[PDB]
Amino acid sequence: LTYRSWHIEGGQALQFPLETALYQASGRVDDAAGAQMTLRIDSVSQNKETYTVTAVINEYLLILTVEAQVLKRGEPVGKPMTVSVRRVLAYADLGKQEEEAALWAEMRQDAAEQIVRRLTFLKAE
């Protein structure tokens, strides 16, 4: 990772997995003031849709969508990026809510990894 000091605006739920990925790429996280780069999360979407019906839903499709803009000292660089993760959710006998929550968690980590990955390739691009 090049130009390694970052500040994350928004995406509270994505903040920790992102930070983790960033340090894993040799970058660092700082306050807005002491940071060269800023990753602004403009939107986070969690959509749960009925998938396999069979008037009795058997499975759900979960879609996590994140939109972010990279900024350098107040100025936008590159186009706004979108990233989305998809997973099928099927329960077995558990914790129906505790399970869906774990999936969203796995997904948020997935999205973080994809965002940081794309950051690692932004300069070249």
Next chain:
Amino acid sequence: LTYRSWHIEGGQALQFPLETALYQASGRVDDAAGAQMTLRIDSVSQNKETYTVTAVINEYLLILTVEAQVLKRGEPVGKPMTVSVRRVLAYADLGKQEEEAALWAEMRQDAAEQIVRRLTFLKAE
């Protein structure tokens, strides 16, 4: 509330507030088998959008969208209904995540109340 025995398919996170509203309307919740009516949640969407910017987000717009279909003994009755709740999220010094979660909770209750309300008026409509 008329035709008062209901079964809810899906919308796990909305299940309790809905049940509560339903009993508050004199209806009852039962298994698929022992229930006249079925309320099938086809989609639940939670979108968090950047609202007031000011490269430093100050406020977020939260939108909860729910889509459900009412069914009578396997057959669809009425059009699919959509309900959406909107709230502005602004933190103060807290628990940034604990607060957003409380808002989504307040909203889910709001949505439940609107769904049950519309159920109370479906026959007439």
